[PDB]
Design a protein around this nucleic acid. Structure first.
Ligand code: MG
Ligand code: MG
Ligand code: MG
Ligand code: MG
Ligand code: MG
Ligand code: MG
Ligand code: MG
Ligand code: MG
Ligand code: MG
Lengths: 292, 75, 159, 170, 213
RNA sequence: GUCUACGGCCAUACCACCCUGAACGCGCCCGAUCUCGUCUGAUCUCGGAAGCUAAGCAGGGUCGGGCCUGGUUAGUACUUGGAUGGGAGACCGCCUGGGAAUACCGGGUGCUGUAGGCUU
RNA sequence: ACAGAAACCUCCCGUGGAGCAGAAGGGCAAAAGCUCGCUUGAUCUUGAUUUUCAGUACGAAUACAGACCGUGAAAGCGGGG
RNA sequence: UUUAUCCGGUAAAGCGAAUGAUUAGAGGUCUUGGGGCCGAAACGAUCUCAACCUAUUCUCAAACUUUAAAUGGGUAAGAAG
RNA sequence: GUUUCCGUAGUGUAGUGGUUAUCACGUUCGCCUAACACGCGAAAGGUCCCCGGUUCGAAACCGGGCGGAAACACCA
């Protein structure tokens, strides 16, 4: 034996964590740092751009923090990109662009600002930083929220930020970790961001893993062979989304009312139904062993 | 030559003989102590109230004659 | 003689209550204060920057200043007689909104309402509060029982 | 039938404890280097002990963690020196197991009169798909109640892949 | 040796328990808080005789010493060496002090009088409240008179006053004695050597499955 | 009915074990070309979509431990004022008011906020 | 494997029972703890306030504002500990 | 003084809640031991005493605390709204 | 009672700053001697008083205690 660590006294003195840290989701320190507004403002919100590349889809959404629970002004997912001609690879760094580009444009058509501060248009992968216009409404500002992503160079979280910055949002961003930063000379290639933004890191993988062997092709990406996507075409997939997204960003959420409303959860058992289960046992125990 | 070392014995009597006074507070207390970036701004707000007095005066007669009309329409 | 130290005897005061040692809940620094608002100081151990001093712990005062994460606040502090209205700088973690004010402003919003109405009638309504009156002669009814007879019970040494 | 309860090797650990801090340790670093194919980490002392000749923050051992395919290829060519037989108390309460060897040349290793004969410590962390839940960063978790590898489940693992004769008696 | 118990009779100063803050305490005089057949069962000793204090006072360690011994001696006697169990329920816990005897040689030349009046530990003492038990004995229901007289002799080693009282509990438990047999069969109570374990309708059902099996 | 993203109050939410999860998602999972990081693609970063609810998670279950609330303990312990009350003293009683804590019995076991799904 | 109550490795449990230069006391867990990389906010400058209090100093501290910066994707944090 | 409303760690209480003391038995080769007695020896048998711990039980804390009073300290009860 | 000082091999004593422990004698074994001395060669021996803390590590640095010692207890 040993001493029982988890005593009765262990649980009497045990104080649980904040729930959202039980699930391991929320850095509230670095949420306290990120969210609370200075009290020289007292009401004006502090917007954050949230990016959580999930496992299969990249969620983008802008939120300010209220005391009831932060409200979401605009959300744009990666599973809506097929509407704009992107069928596959929508957890990849190229698609985090279009997600963040969508998010930026779907936000800027409300508050009537889609006709100003379009940011970089073609694409470069360089230092762009929207400069608010005099005599016009000031540019929209928010601060990137990485959540729990170890933000080394190339990571898509602040790679989706490049989408919002290209969309017209004035987010303070450096380029020290955009894919392309040379961590041994401290500068930019800026044509590496060219490729990674349009999917040539996936094209050149799609071209090394074709000539070397088959059946590694079609196992590494079947749905890129299916749906008739190819190299020499990917660059002209996202270059259409980058244009199709920016001509109509508005969401038109699908109408929903059919459900018959059955309950295939399992309900909570009432008091007296537990209260007899004992006395429904202990009559099955007594009767049984008062024989043999 | 030892002596008493302290006491608060009849002190309550003394400082309640003239009846402890809650500090007399006026309206318009001093702005000394407020952060400079407030004042350094609110002084510019106060310094240029007059530039824009024409709007204020005519717009006052507008509501003064619209509520001289509102009290006369009741009559 | 005792030591003048700023945090003497606070061993038991600034101590986080129980099963709460940890992250400050984020609501406490996302409610807003504006000058005029009444506030009750209540220190707290976890945050040491911008703490009040133990003689204000438990006291209320109105707000006169608002910096980025602190609030200038005027309280009264009694010293050997003369009460000095003195202003201290306290970071927000040691501050609440005192609902002491908020019973009124709800008697006010209701008084102003009950006066605007019943003015088209002219019937004078009891606007003032009024202390708990005499309890207003009534009846008691036993139905079909006499009261239960109570008797002081015989002592016996329990131990 | 079990969909994915494939009891498989998560890692294979090697350790050469030589409380000497210099040569007899710098040479033992090539043993794991040659045997595995990856530069081994230098461990150091937790604190000083007199009777042993070791000092705090002084280097003592050199260790290695080999996983993947090359971990089956050294677990195999591991046992077969113990000739596919172990002892009851090598399979721990947590579903791991370990066996020491006494000389590193019997693992197909060329002996030098300078590079001596330092045996090593083989330890094997058995796993199962879904065990990295503990180690990840976002949304960690505990590995169920079953899905944990018991002492008896790890026993007949080794009796059914390398056909050991696990022998009773301490 | 020691001042008469007079001077340390009243509970004047806050408890001074032996801790890191007072050290060098002379070990308490009384050591053994229960004697007789402490290897008895509950089912064979139904008489909870008590000696209850009636005044809020202190009891010297050396008093609890003689009060125990003189009760062991009118017991094993009429009762026999097996037929009782004696409990002392006051552990001398609060440390009593002595300014250092104002020691002087010859007539004197100096003592300093009161400078550093704070004194050394001298012994230990029990704190007793009104209606709190000092000693308790348990025997057979047969042997009542000999519990009364054995506790009546121990009163004479104690200051103040204390009543002798025979409890309505069974032996040393907390359970009213008219109810024991009823709460033993049907197992609301389970023998546990000296004491007894009250098993409620709370725990897991298998914990029952052991009993009534 | 329920989930996902970001949350508020932070156990009625925890812990231990037991059972069941349609579809969307969440996940496990499959690789190391590029980005990035390691003694180790184990974690982190990245490219994925062959499998499975085995687990996390969700949902329940336990005369379960814990917590949350009531009852009792108890008008008991204690106490604001009061007496030319009692007592050698320790202390105790009464008058005027306020009024606890265990053991021991019950009941409950996460509420919701915004934005999006799925059950069309 | 040599290896023993103690070296090294691995898994499991671990609300803090460790650690935080020092006395204690508070406070602290994807921290304020430990390990790394980059550094000089331990810098220049007015006032306001707190603490002892006469509501004088000194010491120490708390919020700001103005410069120059450090750091980090950034929100921020930092004018000794 | 009411009516709202915050503040509090003293009396009491508790220690089958932490920390610190501490009695007893039942339970445990937990661990292990040091003596034994029956054993060459044997977790073999029976003891024993030590230390731990599984349900218990006796008694405590000014420099301990889950709880937690009474008296008491703030504000607020409008025209400066 | 207050203020100092020490404790190290069988014995008296060195010693360091925190990595090591001496000297002399005693003792054990040889050698010379007819035999002892003397002399020559080798040897073995201490928790560095008992403690807890600090520290990587204490015999040595702190705190308490135990034992042996020294110095004050004046004006009436
Ligand atoms: Mg961070
Ligand atoms: Mg005098
Ligand atoms: Mg992998
Ligand atoms: Mg599952
Ligand atoms: Mg399942
Ligand atoms: Mg329960
Ligand atoms: Mg500055
Ligand atoms: Mg620091
Ligand atoms: Mg106090």
């Amino acid at each position: 034996f040993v001493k029982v660590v988890k005593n009765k006294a262990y649980f009497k003195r045990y104080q649980v964590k904040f729930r959202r840290r039980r699930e391991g989701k929320t850095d509230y320190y670095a949420r306290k740092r990120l969210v609370i507004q200075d009290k020289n403002k007292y009401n004006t919100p502090k917007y954050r751009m949230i990016v959580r590349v999930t496992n299969r889809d990249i969620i983008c959404q802008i939120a300010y923090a209220r005391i009831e629970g932060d409200m979401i002004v605009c959300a744009a997912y990666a599973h809506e990109l097929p509407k704009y001609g992107v069928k596959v690879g929508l957890t990849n760094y190229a698609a985090a662009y279009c997600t963040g580009l969508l998010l930026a444009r779907r936000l800027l058509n409300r508050f009537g600002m889609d006709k100003i501060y379009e940011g970089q248009v073609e694409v470069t992968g360089d230092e762009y930083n929207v400069e608010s216009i005099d005599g016009q409404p000031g540019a929209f500002t928010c601060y990137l929220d990485a959540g729990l992503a170890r933000t080394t160079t190339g990571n898509k979280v602040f790679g989706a930020l490049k989408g919002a910055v290209d969309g017209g949002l004035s987010i303070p961003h450096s380029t020290k970790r955009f894919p392309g930063y040379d961590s041994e000379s401290k500068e930019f290639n800026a044509e590496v961001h060219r490729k990674h933004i349009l999917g040539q890191n996936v094209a050149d993988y799609m071209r090394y893993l074709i000539e070397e062997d088959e059946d590694a092709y079609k196992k590494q990406f079947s749905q890129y062979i299916k749906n008739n996507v190819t190299p020499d075409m990917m660059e002209e997939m996202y270059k259409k989304a980058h244009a199709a997204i920016r001509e109509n960003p508005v969401y038109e959420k699908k109408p929903k009312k059919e459900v018959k409303k059955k309950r295939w959860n399992r309900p909570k058992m009432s008091l007296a139904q537990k209260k007899d289960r004992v006395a429904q046992k202990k009559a099955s125990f007594l009767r049984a062993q008062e024989r043999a | 030559a030892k002596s008493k070392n302290h006491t608060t014995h009849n002190q309550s009597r003394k400082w309640h003989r003239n009846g402890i006074k809650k500090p007399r507070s006026q309206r318009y207390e001093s702005l000394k102590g407020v952060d400079p970036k407030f004042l350094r701004n609110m002084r510019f707000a106060k310094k240029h109230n007059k530039k824009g007095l024409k709007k204020m005066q005519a717009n006052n007669a507008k509501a003064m004659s619209a509520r001289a009309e509102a009290i006369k329409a009741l009559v | 003689t005792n030591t003048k130290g700023k945090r003497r005897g606070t061993r038991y005061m600034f101590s986080r209550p129980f099963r709460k040692h940890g992250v400050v809940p984020l609501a406490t620094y996302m409610r807003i204060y504006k000058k005029g608002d009444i506030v009750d100081i209540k220190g707290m151990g976890t945050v040491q920057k911008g703490m009040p001093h133990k003689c204000y712990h438990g006291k209320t005062g109105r707000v006169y200043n608002v910096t980025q994460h602190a609030v200038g606040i005027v309280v009264n502090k009694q010293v050997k007689g003369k009460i000095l209205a003195k202003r201290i700088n306290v970071r927000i973690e040691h501050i609440k909104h005192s609902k002491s004010r908020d019973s009124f402003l709800k008697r006010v919003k209701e008084n102003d309402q009950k006066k605007k109405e019943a003015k088209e009638k002219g019937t004078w309504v009891q606007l003032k509060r009024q202390p708990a009156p005499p309890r207003e002669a009534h009846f008691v009814r036993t139905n079909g029982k006499e009261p239960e007879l109570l008797e002081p019970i015989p002592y016996e040494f329990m131990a | 039938e079990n969909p994915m309860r494939e009891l498989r090797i998560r890692k294979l650990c090697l350790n050469i404890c030589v409380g000497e801090s210099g040569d007899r340790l710098t040479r033992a670093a090539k043993v794991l280097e040659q045997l595995t194919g990856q530069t081994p980490v230098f461990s150091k002392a937790r604190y000083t002990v007199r009777s042993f000749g070791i000092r705090r923050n002084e280097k003592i051992a050199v260790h290695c963690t080999v996983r993947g395919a090359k971990a089956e290829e050294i677990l195999e060519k591991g046992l077969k020196v113990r000739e596919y037989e172990l002892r009851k108390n090598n399979f721990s309460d947590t579903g791991n197991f370990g066996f020491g060897i006494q000389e590193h040349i019997d693992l197909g290793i060329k002996y030098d009169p300078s590079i001596g004969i330092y045996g090593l410590d083989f330890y094997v962390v058995l796993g199962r798909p879904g065990f990295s839940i503990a180690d990840k960063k976002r949304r960690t978790g505990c590995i169920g109640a079953k899905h944990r590898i018991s002492k008896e489940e790890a026993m007949r693992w080794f009796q059914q892949k390398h056909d050991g004769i696990i022998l009773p008696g301490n | 040796g020691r001042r008469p118990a007079r001077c340390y009779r009243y509970c004047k100063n806050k408890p001074y328990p032996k801790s890191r803050f007072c050290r060098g305490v002379p070990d308490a005089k009384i050591r053994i808080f229960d004697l007789g057949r402490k290897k008895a069962k509950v089912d064979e000793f139904p008489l909870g005789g008590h000696m209850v204090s009636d005044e809020y006072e202190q009891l010297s360690s050396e008093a609890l010493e003689a009060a125990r011994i003189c009760a062991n001696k009118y017991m094993v006697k009429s009762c026999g060496r097996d037929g009782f169990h004696m409990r002392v329920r006051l552990h001398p816990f609060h440390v009593i002090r002595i300014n250092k005897m104002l020691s002087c040689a010859g007539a004197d030349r100096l003592q300093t009088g009161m400078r550093g009046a704070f004194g050394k530990p001298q012994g230990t003492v029990a704190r007793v409240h009104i209606g709190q038990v000092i000693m308790s004995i348990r025997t057979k229901l047969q042997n009542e008179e000999h519990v009364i007289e054995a506790l009546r002799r121990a009163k004479f080693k104690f200051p103040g006053r204390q009543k002798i009282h025979i409890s309505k509990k069974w032996g040393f438990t907390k359970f009213n004695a008219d109810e024991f047999e009823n709460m033993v069969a049907k197992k609301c109570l389970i023998p546990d050597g000296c004491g007894v374990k009250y098993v409620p309708n709370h725990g897991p059902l298998d914990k029952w499955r052991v009993l009534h099996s």
